Amino acid sequence: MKGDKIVIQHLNKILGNELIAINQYFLHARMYEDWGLEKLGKHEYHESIDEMKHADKLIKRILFLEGLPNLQELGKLLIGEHTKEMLECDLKLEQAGLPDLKAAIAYCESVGDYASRELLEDILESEEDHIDWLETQLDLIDKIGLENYLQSQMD
Amino acid sequence: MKGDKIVIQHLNKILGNELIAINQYFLHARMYEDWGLEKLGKHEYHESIDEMKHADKLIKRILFLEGLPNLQELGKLLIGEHTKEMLECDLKLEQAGLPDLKAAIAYCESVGDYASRELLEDILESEEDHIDWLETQLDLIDKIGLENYLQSQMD
Amino acid sequence: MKGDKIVIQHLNKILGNELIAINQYFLHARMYEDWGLEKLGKHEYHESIDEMKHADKLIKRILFLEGLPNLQELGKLLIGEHTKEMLECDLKLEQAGLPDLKAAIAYCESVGDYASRELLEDILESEEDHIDWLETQLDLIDKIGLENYLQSQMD
Amino acid sequence: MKGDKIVIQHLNKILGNELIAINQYFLHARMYEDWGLEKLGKHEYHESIDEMKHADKLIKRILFLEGLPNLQELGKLLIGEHTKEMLECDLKLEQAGLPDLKAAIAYCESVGDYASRELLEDILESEEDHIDWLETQLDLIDKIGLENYLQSQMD
Amino acid sequence: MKGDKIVIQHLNKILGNELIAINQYFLHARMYEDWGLEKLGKHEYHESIDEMKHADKLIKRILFLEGLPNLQELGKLLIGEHTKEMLECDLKLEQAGLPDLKAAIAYCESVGDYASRELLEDILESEEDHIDWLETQLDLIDKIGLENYLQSQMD
Amino acid sequence: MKGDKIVIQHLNKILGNELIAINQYFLHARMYEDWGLEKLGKHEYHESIDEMKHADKLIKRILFLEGLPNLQELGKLLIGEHTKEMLECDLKLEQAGLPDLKAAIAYCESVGDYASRELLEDILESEEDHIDWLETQLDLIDKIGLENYLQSQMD
Amino acid sequence: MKGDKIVIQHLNKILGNELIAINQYFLHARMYEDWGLEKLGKHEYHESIDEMKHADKLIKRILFLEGLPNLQELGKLLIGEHTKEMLECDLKLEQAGLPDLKAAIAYCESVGDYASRELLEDILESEEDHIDWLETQLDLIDKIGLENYLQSQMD
Ligand code: HEM
Ligand code: HEM
Ligand code: HEM
Ligand code: HEM
Ligand SMILES: [Fe+2]
Ligand SMILES: [Fe+2]
Ligand SMILES: [Fe+2]
Ligand SMILES: [Fe+2]
Ligand SMILES: [Fe+2]
Ligand SMILES: [Fe+2]
Ligand SMILES: [Fe+2]
Ligand SMILES: [Fe+2]
Ligand SMILES: [Fe+2]
Ligand SMILES: [Fe+2]
């Protein structure tokens, strides 16, 4: 079914964001495991698979709407060098993508593509949760100290 | 453990190849499913997951060797527009990568990084299998005809 | 138990035929599977196993009759290059041999080696089946066309 | 996937060795059982099967590499007349072949056919094992005497 | 159903042979157990029950053919005094009966009593196996020595 | 099977290193347990057992090659007095043994003892893993402090 | 808890004897296995493990008593070249260590280290059991002959 040109453009924009998250989180996930911080690596890993599922949903929607998915463009990955910076980079990435998801939902609504809006709504609800976990870890670090926090992420 | 500079460089090259394969196959996988070719989609999908595992192993090895994994650079995906073309694009991708894996195995041997060579050999074996499956599909299209081949890929 | 000289010679002759069949069908089996024709590969593989079993039975009988089994001689192998040809070559073998089993049975009866006759009897009944199956495949190719036939042998 | 002509030639040479082993062991196995040496018969039988599996793997690799399997030529079979001799004949074959697998692995290395090398390595590890068992049986005969050794192979 | 007079005479001849085997093997079986050679006694015992089943089949066939079974005539039992002689006596008995079974099958064929021939065929196949086991034990005795052989027959 | 003289020397060299590791890791494991650092104790213990298994494999290969395993010369054990130092002693031992293993693999490859090379490659993979774990524990101590690190090792 | 200096010296002496036994028996175990004497190998193997457990108990006791376990000194291994010699080597070892164990027990009693005495009594009971088995094997060899004995150790 021929979809709205601007909607497909919006969906592709979002897909691009997801692909960046996929790579960033997978790399951060393995860096954590490499450092022996198994709990962070596991969670970071799960988030990576989550973003992978988000991208998959966008890809399927774009193809149904008869658009051409863009798996070619890969934006700037924000790779940190230590735990605090890595959590901040992931937080910065998620927060940098919100205006995009909200702008996409708003556009879909304006053109009546209610099903695309629903898909984006599900993704947004998940992104606000990831931001929640991230903000929480950063706050935990400040309340208990970096050494205790990292100690708690070992097993 | 500080790894050999040229070996890590080789591992990053291969990683870049795997990342390309990941994206190309996942897009082809969903394009197949989108067209109702379930069997091709399922097989294409699993190949994508396999390349994902290959990339994961390289990333883990690079980090142990104290190198910096490059998930930032993404080569040109070869996206086909119809089945025969998609099969040929995937075959071409795997064939362009062989010289790379063999060159890496050869280099690892020359410098004594036998563990890295073993990882690469495991990937090479899998790669020669995918090429086998791909060459086989193209040969099948030739023997039974495109219409019959696509019919056989529906369920 | 000293067996009849001519019977043992007949037995060794049939054994040579079996060893030929074993190798021919095993090569054909792997060629089919190499081309992605699983169904043909499975059947041919089973037939190869059946011939192996026949050879085993002849070998055992020969040894009991105090003769020397000859696994040294291997007659011409009739290797085909395509499905239709491979089917015809296998059919030719199952036929070129038929007169041998019948002649051995006739000889055993004439010299009173009723046990050897029964063993050959069992093999004969099985041989007339591989032939039945082979004749059927060729007639099937004629009724539905090579492309449809090959398609049906993929999975 | 076209393989190196010399590699395929080596593969065919090894395949010829395997086919000789298969037949020699199958005959020895049935000779053992015919004499009431059940244990010896079972081992030889299994060893015959393993050689069949080796031949099968070579045949598959050759086909994939786009070469033509030679199941036609069968070399000299070394048939023994009694236990001690049969063990020695099997040992010669298992040794005489060693140079071959080692030469093939060496050639595969030099031309970068690492997958073929690994297939040959698997077979090689197994061959050094059949040799071990054979050398042991002969050393055992020397330590306990032929009469005791044969008694121990009855049931 | 009125059977052929000569066939019934042949069947009675065979029954007589079976009855001799029954008694000879049962006696030899218990002598073995009496000497503590449980493995020989068990096998010898099983053979006795086997001959008992052969006789039973002949008896049933003779009665259907409306003949009078002769359980009255009992030929000369060949009782040995030691293991080697006992195995030879059993061997001599089985070999002395073959010409009779083969002559019976030949006669049945000449007069069209195909069902009687089938019954005799089953018995012949079993007798050639008993002869096999016997010849084997005698050969085993010569290869490993009488003391080792008897030792192996204790449990 | 008479193996290469220098290969055997190489294998005995690696065996010598393994024996040192066995004793060093076992004493360290029991020291950790004695101090109530159960987790560290369990891990050190299992590494001790893995080194015992490496020694075993080397001994078996040396015997097969008809060489004489040397379990008489015990090299210098590097025994620590506190966690940080024990991890460092184990790391130093592991690092000192790498050049030997790689030199042995290189030599086996040069004379065609491909099976010995494989055994050594297996051991090498395990050694690099232990080094990875060791380096990680030391990095962890520096990131969360020794007190936290040790607390996490109590159970 | 600070242990008696001389008690610890005795414990280290016994530990040294255990370390000799461990290596001697493990090598003998694999030699038996190497020659196909599985039964002897399995037993020798288990005894090697029992000595490993004795050493473990000694090490733990020494550490509790705040002494330094000595795993650096390795005494003269008594390696045999054939079964009878290996059994005698192990017997000589066990016999040589017996006076040492009894001297250690006597000393512990004199200084009131009853728990250390308990541990030594447990080990002594086990050592006298190995001596019993060893003496019995050598007596069995004289009673049934070396050839029969070795035959019985194959499985
Ligand atoms: C940096 C590139 C990537 C890496 C390193 C990676 C790695 C992985 C790994 C290790 C798994 C687990 C597979 C398993 O063990 O079963 C996985 C699963 C998967 N990936 Fe990726 N992946 C990458 C990119 C992608 C992309 C771009 C997509 C989407 C187009 C994607 C979609 C999926 C899906 C759908 C699954 C299965 C998720 C599930 O369990 O439901 N991946 N990936
Ligand atoms: C020429 C003499 C041969 C004889 C007498 C023989 C006999 C046998 C027998 C009796 C079996 C076991 C069947 C069963 O019980 O299911 C067997 C299995 C098998 N044979 Fe052969 N064989 C021969 C040659 C070969 C050759 C030349 C090949 C390869 C081209 C081959 C490949 C196989 C395979 C792959 C199996 C499967 C075994 C398993 O998966 O466990 N055989 N053979
Ligand atoms: C020397 C004379 C014989 C002796 C010592 C003898 C002894 C035995 C013994 C001990 C059994 C096992 C019974 C049980 O424990 O269940 C048996 C079974 C039997 N006997 Fe006999 N028997 C003799 C003669 C015969 C004869 C002459 C015939 C045939 C007319 C015969 C036919 C059978 C049958 C049919 C069975 C059962 C076999 C089965 O299990 O299928 N026996 N006999
Ligand atoms: C200080 C010297 C040694 C000590 C204290 C020691 C200790 C141990 C302990 C406590 C076990 C576990 C036994 C159980 O509870 O089942 C064991 C197992 C084992 N040890 Fe040792 N050992 C030593 C030396 C060796 C040596 C030198 C070898 C051989 C070259 C060796 C080979 C083995 C093997 C194969 C096992 C069994 C591993 C398995 O579970 O698969 N050990 N050892
Ligand atoms: Fe997302
Ligand atoms: Fe997110
Ligand atoms: Fe890959
Ligand atoms: Fe691939
Ligand atoms: Fe056949
Ligand atoms: Fe056939
Ligand atoms: Fe082989
Ligand atoms: Fe072999
Ligand atoms: Fe009978
Ligand atoms: Fe009989």
Ligand SMILES: [Fe+2]
């Ligand atoms: Fe090791």
Ligand SMILES: [Fe+2]
């Ligand atoms: Fe290690």
Ligand SMILES: [Fe+2]
């Ligand atoms: Fe002990």
Ligand SMILES: [Fe+2]
């Ligand atoms: Fe002991």
Ligand SMILES: [Fe+2]
């Ligand atoms: Fe004996």
Ligand SMILES: [Mg+2]
């Ligand atoms: Mg559509």
Ligand SMILES: [Mg+2]
């Ligand atoms: Mg590290």
Ligand SMILES: [Mg+2]
């Ligand atoms: Mg390898």
Ligand SMILES: [Mg+2]
């Ligand atoms: Mg015979």
Ligand SMILES: [Mg+2]
């Ligand atoms: Mg019939």
Ligand SMILES: [Mg+2]
């Ligand atoms: Mg192909």
Ligand SMILES: [Mg+2]
């Ligand atoms: Mg009636």
Ligand SMILES: [Mg+2]
């Ligand atoms: Mg040996």
Ligand SMILES: [Mg+2]
């Ligand atoms: Mg303490």
Ligand SMILES: [Mg+2]
């Ligand atoms: Mg007490």
